[PDB]
From a paper:
The protease plays a crucial role in viral replication by cleaving the polyprotein into individual nonstructural proteins. The substrate binding pockets S1 to S4 in the HuNoV protease, which accommodates the P1 to P4 residues of the substrate, are in the cavity between the BII-CII loop (beta strands BII and CII, residue 102–117) and the DII, EII, and FII beta strands of the second beta-barrel.
To ascertain that similar conformational changes in the BII-CII loop occur in other GII-Pros in response to rupintrivir binding, we first determined the crystal structures of apo GII.4-Pro Sydney (2012 GII.4 variant) and GII.3-Pro to 2.4 Å and 2.6 Å, respectively, followed by their crystal structures in complex with rupintrivir to 2.5 Å and 2.71 Å resolution. The closed conformation of the BII-CII loop and the R112 sidechain conformation, as observed in the structures of GII.4-Pro, narrow the S2, S3, and S4 pockets in the apo protease. By contrast, the GII-Pro apo structure shows severe clashes with the P2, P3, and P4 groups of the modeled rupintrivir molecule. Isoleucine-109 and methionine-107 clash with rupintrivir’s P3 and P4 groups, respectively, while the P2 of rupintrivir primarily clashes with the R112 sidechain. In GII-Pros, the BII-CII loop is stabilized only by a hydrogen bond between histidine-104 and alanine-79, located at the bottom of the loop.
Residue numbers in the entry:
A (entry chain B): 0 to 33, 39 to 101, 116 to 122, 136 to 161, 165 to 172
B (entry chain A): 0 to 34, 39 to 123, 132 to 172
Write the structure that this text describes.
Amino acid sequence: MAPPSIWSRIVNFGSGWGFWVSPSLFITSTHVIPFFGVPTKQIQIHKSGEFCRLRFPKPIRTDVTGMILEEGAPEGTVATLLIKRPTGELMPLAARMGQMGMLLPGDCGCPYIYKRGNDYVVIGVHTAAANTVICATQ
Amino acid sequence: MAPPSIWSRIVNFGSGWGFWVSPSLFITSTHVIPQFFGVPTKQIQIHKSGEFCRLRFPKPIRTDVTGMILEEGAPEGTVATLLIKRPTGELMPLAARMGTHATMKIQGRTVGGQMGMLLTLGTTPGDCGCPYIYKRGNDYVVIGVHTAAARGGNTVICATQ
């Protein structure tokens, strides 16, 4: 259901994963932050509570289109937790959810997506789980 | 292009990449082999046919994937898709018109494989190990692995067998 281009946005970072919103915007969780060739000082790091945004002065992923990132998902939205594993396996997981989710480590940082019209929407990143799941917000 | 499950079979293997044809079969390029997947190099059944390296492991490692048809190249004129992954994460499916088998010198190294040509950015040595794939009905089919590329040309070599 999620095309390869959106999977390619998910890239391993630190101890887990992160996600490309644009050629220059990259989101992840704070527990995986130990950058991509760019000095750690030439980046905007705006941590926001187990959620972190990284903005580079130059595009890094020019292959990637600008995708909408919202705070969360309206209650009842069936988001999709796109977990990647070190072996290369892709693990899509249907989550009912806007901040806490019900399914139907090193995974933290993987994004939450839900399709609205002919365009995808990011709503946060994987924070922790132990059927329960949690999604970090802006 | 191709679905995610096919792309997820492509993984970094040393200097370049490799391809999980089945849960236990792993094709790659002999030159990208590091100097595997948490397995003793002795325990792995290695086979080589030029710059083509086929690794059959004793235990199914990649249980998420399925078996896929692996063939010795493709007939002349077939348009295969070289599935390139770059270390930045980007995906680059490139169409290639497979030609005949040839032998050439590149980087002080005599290379052999099924020549192909990229059709309307370009390949890099870090891209070796990635698969040439063309769909035959419903079945996706692997024909070999990227092993070399001409200095300036769009000629490309596909390790076969």
